[PDB]
């Protein structure tokens, strides 16, 4: 028992160390998620002010063009041309109803124009991000697809000291930040259900009376029937 006593005296130190690191990370996720909620509520009030200052003097407020798109794949894997098939691989949309967050810059929009009959994209809200990260957000840990259960498992994954909780990931996704790529390449591609209530027409664009293409924030009610 001379060897077995030193092991449980070292296991005794690793229990109080994980109990300290659990409550230390509970506070700095309680504190950091309050900071972001003040930003989400306060900066939302700022644009309500500027759009009244615009409207009162007959001016217009050109809103900032959206920097983040949510992109779900709505057609299956059959009969796909090799240019369209590679872009659907480079967006990590390899199965039907897989969904990814992408940036909305000029390199990414010219990839989304080339595969529009296969995808339905649009502009997500704050609740669309946090429903996808909480309910159906998983991570690539040890090359495996493991579901987000605690913020310790997120902090063990990214090792960034800026991404320590699940509100850090919905921060970097919703407001692009310095680490949009590392958060989204951190997660597995989101695998959603088919939408309840149906799809109107898979084979035509959203303007034509169907479903593919861009929805200039209407993609939230379509994803709210899937998450």
């Amino acid at each position: 028992a001379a060897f077995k006593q030193q092991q449980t005296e070292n296991f005794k130190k690793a229990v109080v160390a994980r109990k300290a690191a659990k409550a230390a990370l509970k506070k700095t996720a309680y504190l950091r998620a309050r900071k972001y909620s003040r930003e989400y509520r306060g900066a939302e009030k700022k644009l309500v002010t500027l759009r009244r200052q615009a409207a009162s003097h007959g001016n217009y407020y050109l809103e900032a063009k959206p920097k983040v798109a949510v992109v779900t794949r709505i057609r299956g894997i059959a009969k796909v041309n090799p240019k369209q098939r590679k872009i659907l691989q480079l967006l990590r949309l390899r199965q039907i109803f897989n969904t990814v967050f992408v940036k909305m810059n000029k390199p990414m929009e010219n990839m989304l124009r080339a595969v529009e009959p296969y995808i339905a994209y649009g502009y997500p809200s704050l609740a669309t991000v946090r429903a996808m990260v909480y309910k159906r957000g998983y991570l690539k840990i040890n090359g495996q697809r493991v579901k987000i259960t605690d913020n310790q498992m997120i902090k063990d994954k990214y090792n960034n000291a800026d991404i320590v909780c699940a509100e850090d990931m919905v921060n970097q996704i919703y407001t692009c930040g310095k680490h949009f790529r590392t958060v989204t390449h951190g997660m597995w591609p989101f695998k959603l259900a088919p939408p309840a209530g149906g799809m109107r027409q898979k084979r035509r664009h959203f303007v034509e009376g169907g479903d593919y293409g861009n929805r200039d924030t209407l993609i939230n009610r379509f994803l709210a029937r899937m998450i």
Binding site: G76, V80, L88, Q95
Partner: peptide
């Protein structure tokens, strides 16, 4: 249902 073409 996954498009795993060059995966083998």
């Amino acid at each position: 249902g996954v498009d795993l073409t060059g995966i083998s």
